[PDB]
């Protein structure tokens, strides 16, 4: 029968590793780098687009930075198609929580659930895992600004600063070097762009190659506001930091 053609996607190696989860992580190590930095007054999300053309429309483009909630957002590393499948369930989950409790979903609860879905494809069903790593940037009235990461194994952790995709090893050391606990957001913007600029496999870091976002409390409003930077806005902030 079909026994002959089964890859056995959900089995352990003699070493105790999950073959497919391992190879999926390798796939992600080739995807454009994404960075998240949590400050005292907000969070930054910076991402590097891959294989850009001059004819590629950036205005209508949104491949790495997605809005999950009115207060939670994600950076994506890996298969965009796989990520959109999960992003949609996450959006549904946040809405179910709101319809049940009349309160916005706490960031960790939303993360645990996605991470639980990914873990499923690891243990049963004989299907391939999702080739995706997420950075989660969010806010709730319990923990304030939060930053999480999740990979194909369904494992998630909490960070002050983190990177996913290509050159994470190099990117994490640069962050560990320049990050301090009492950081202002405008400083965290610079660190994110500087780190990307150093780990880039491209010649230079330009606006048409970047996706950029912030989550910040109202400078006058008193509540939480998301901002997905537009091409012209990134071009502005890239001149400020000293990259042009």
């Amino acid at each position: 029968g079909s026994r002959r053609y089964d890859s056995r996607t959900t089995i352990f190696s003699p070493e105790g590793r999950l073959y497919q989860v391992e190879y999926a992580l390798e796939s992600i190590s080739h995807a454009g780098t994404a960075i998240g930095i949590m400050a005292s007054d907000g969070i930054v999300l910076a991402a590097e687009r891959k294989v850009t053309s001059t004819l590629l429309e950036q205005d209508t483009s949104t491949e790495k930075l997605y809005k999950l909630n009115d207060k939670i957002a994600v950076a994506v590393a890996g298969l965009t198609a796989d990520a959109e499948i999960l992003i949609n369930t996450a959006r549904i989950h946040a809405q179910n929580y709101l319809k049940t409790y009349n309160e916005d979903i706490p960031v960790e609860i939303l993360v645990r659930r996605l991470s639980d879905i990914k873990q499923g494809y690891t243990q049963h069903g004989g299907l391939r895992p999702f080739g995706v790593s997420f950075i989660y940037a969010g806010y709730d009235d319990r923990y304030g600004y939060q930053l999480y990461t999740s990979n194909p194994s369904g494992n998630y952790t909490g960070w002050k600063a983190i990177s996913v995709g290509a050159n994470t090893s190099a990117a994490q050391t640069l962050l560990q070097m320049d990050y301090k606990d009492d950081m202002k957001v405008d400083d965290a913007i610079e660190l994110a762009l500087k780190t990307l600029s150093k780990t880039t496999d491209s010649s230079a870091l330009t606006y048409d190659r970047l996706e950029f976002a912030t989550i910040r409390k109202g400078a006058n409003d008193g509540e939480v506001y998301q901002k997905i930077f537009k091409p012209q806005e990134i071009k502005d902030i890239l001149v400020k930091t000293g990259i042009t």
């Binding site: 029968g1 079909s2 026994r3 053609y5 089964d6 890859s7 056995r8 996607t9 497919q20 190879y23 999926a24 390798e26 796939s27 992600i28 190590s29 080739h30 053309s53 001059t54 004819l55 590629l56 429309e57 205005d59 209508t60 483009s61 491949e63 298969l79 965009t80 198609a81 796989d82 959109e84 499948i85 069903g125 004989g126 299907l127 391939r128 895992p129 080739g131």
Partner: protein, 250 residues
């Protein structure tokens, strides 16, 4: 009878590559060239009609398809996989949108639905990915004109202009030189015909070339008068006669 293929046929290799997606993309490279160009007041999608026999009737086989009154699709790769995708894309536009909102889906959302169907073909038990790249051109009230490309993986990208299939590498170069943000629709059709000529080995006319636009509303193509808000389809497939006119002065 008993389907024993409940497991994935597309899995990760030690290098990180998803074999079946990559091979599907290889099938798309062998396919005939198709392209799309976005002008300020419209979008144009074009391809070559590669006939299997001089006894076959090429009119009975459309490589360009209407998806909604305002959205059209073209492809490179395996014909049959495209045909069944077109059927499903037309249906999903109703079930997942029109039956809910009483209006047609915007270009980006129908593209999103198409991509989902192809992502499932990457992960579901007992299936292979689709062997096609699509180019979807369309209009909606709040976005205007847009052009998308959908890959076998289920990924989609917005383009000012692009080409897929055989001569895509050379055609993308040719488009880069010629495209600007101030192109009128008649200019865009002119480039479309010129770019497609570099790909076509044989006869170049309205019988061997398939070309359609997303432009102004066509009230004479609606079929009925009376409702002022209903103005008519923006998708229009050009006739063999209409193509030849622009080729006489080309």
């Amino acid at each position: 009878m008993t389907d024993r293929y409940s497991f994935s046929l597309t899995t990760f290799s030690p290098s990180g590559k998803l074999g079946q997606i990559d091979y599907a993309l290889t099938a798309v490279k062998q396919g005939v060239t198709s392209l799309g160009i976005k002008a300020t007041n419209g979008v144009v999608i074009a391809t070559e009609k590669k006939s299997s026999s001089p006894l076959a009737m090429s009119e009975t086989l459309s490589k360009v398809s209407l998806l909604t009154p305002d959205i059209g699709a073209v492809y490179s790769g395996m014909g049959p996989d495209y045909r069944v995708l077109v059927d499903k894309s037309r249906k999903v536009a109703h079930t997942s949108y029109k039956r809910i909102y009483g209006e047609y889906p915007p270009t980006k959302l129908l593209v999103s639905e198409v991509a989902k169907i192809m992502q499932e073909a990457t992960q579901s038990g007992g299936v292979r990915p689709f062997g096609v790249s699509l180019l979807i051109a369309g209009h909606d009230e709040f976005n205007g004109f847009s052009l998308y490309q959908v890959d076998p993986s289920g990924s989609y990208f917005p383009w000012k202009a692009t080409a897929i299939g055989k001569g895509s590498v050379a055609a993308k170069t040719f488009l880069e030189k010629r495209w600007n943000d101030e192109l009128e629709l008649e200019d865009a059709i002119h480039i479309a015909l010129l770019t497609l000529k570099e790909s076509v080995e044989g006869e170049f006319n309205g019988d061997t070339i398939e070309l359609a636009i997303i432009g102004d509303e066509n009230p004479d193509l609606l079929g009925y008068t009376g409702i002022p808000t209903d103005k008519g389809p923006r998708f229009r497939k050009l006739t063999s006669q209409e193509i030849n006119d622009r080729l006489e002065a080309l």
